[PDB]
């Protein structure tokens, strides 16, 4: 699948050292399917693969 | 016969006076600090709101 | 979460306070004094009649 018109917002963030940050990403998908999520920085770790 | 006005009629700040026991009630003087310990169960997350 | 506020001692007048706890939706509490009593400690000197 391919995604367009993507944007991100952060309701809240706490650096608690236990995934205290949350982010919500809006997307428009070309079709139903699965994608893979990866951080582009070493400063931020994303829990979901 | 010469008692004059009682304290409940002459007191400052609108104080009400009662006996048995002797006490002053609802005097409009100063302020009152309050500290509340609120349990985490009472809070709703920003993602829930 | 410990929240500390100060309100006037005026009776019958409600006050509102905002609790700000990051990561959670803002909470609003309302407090009102219904009665304030100042009870003096007395020591009897004598009875007259």
């Amino acid at each position: 699948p391919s995604l367009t018109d993507m944007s991100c917002e952060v309701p809240a963030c706490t650096h608690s050292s236990d995934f205290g940050g949350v982010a919500v990403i809006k997307y428009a998908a070309s079709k139903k399917g699965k994608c893979a999520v990866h951080s582009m920085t070493n400063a931020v770790t994303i829990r979901e693969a | 016969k010469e008692r004059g006005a009682s304290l409940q009629h002459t007191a400052p700040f609108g104080c009400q006076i009662a006996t048995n026991p002797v006490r002053a009630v609802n005097c409009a003087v100063g302020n009152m600090p309050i500290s509340i310990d609120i349990p985490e169960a009472a809070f709703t997350r920003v993602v829930d709101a | 979460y410990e929240h500390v506020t100060v309100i006037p001692n005026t009776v019958g007048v409600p006050y509102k306070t905002l609790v700000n706890r990051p990561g959670y939706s803002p909470m609003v509490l309302e407090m009102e004094l219904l009665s304030v009593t100042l009870e003096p400690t007395l020591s009897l000197d004598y009875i007259t009649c």
Side-chain angles (χ1 to χ4, degrees), chain B residues 24 26 29 32 34 36 38 44, chain C residues 1 3 5 7 9 25 36 38:
Chain B
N26 299 344
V29 180
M32 179 186 293
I34 300 170
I36 304 171
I38 304 167
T44 297
Chain C
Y1 185 91
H3 187 67
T5 68
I7 62 170
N9 286 332
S25 178
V36 179
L38 306 176

Side-chain angles (χ1 to χ4, degrees), chain B residues 21-40 42-47 49, chain C residues 1-9 11 19 21 23-25 27 29 31 33-40 42:
Chain B
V22 175
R23 61 202 189 274
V25 179
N26 299 344
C27 295
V29 180
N31 62 60
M32 179 186 293
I34 300 170
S35 175
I36 304 171
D37 184 349
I38 304 167
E40 65 275 19
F43 288 87
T44 297
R45 298 177 302 172
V46 297
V47 300
Chain C
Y1 185 91
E2 183 179 5
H3 187 67
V4 180
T5 68
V6 180
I7 62 170
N9 286 332
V11 175
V19 181
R21 183 182 177 166
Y24 299 88
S25 178
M27 177 187 295
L29 302 175
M31 297 190 286
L33 297 169
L34 301 178
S35 177
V36 179
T37 300
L38 306 176
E39 182 176 354
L42 304 178

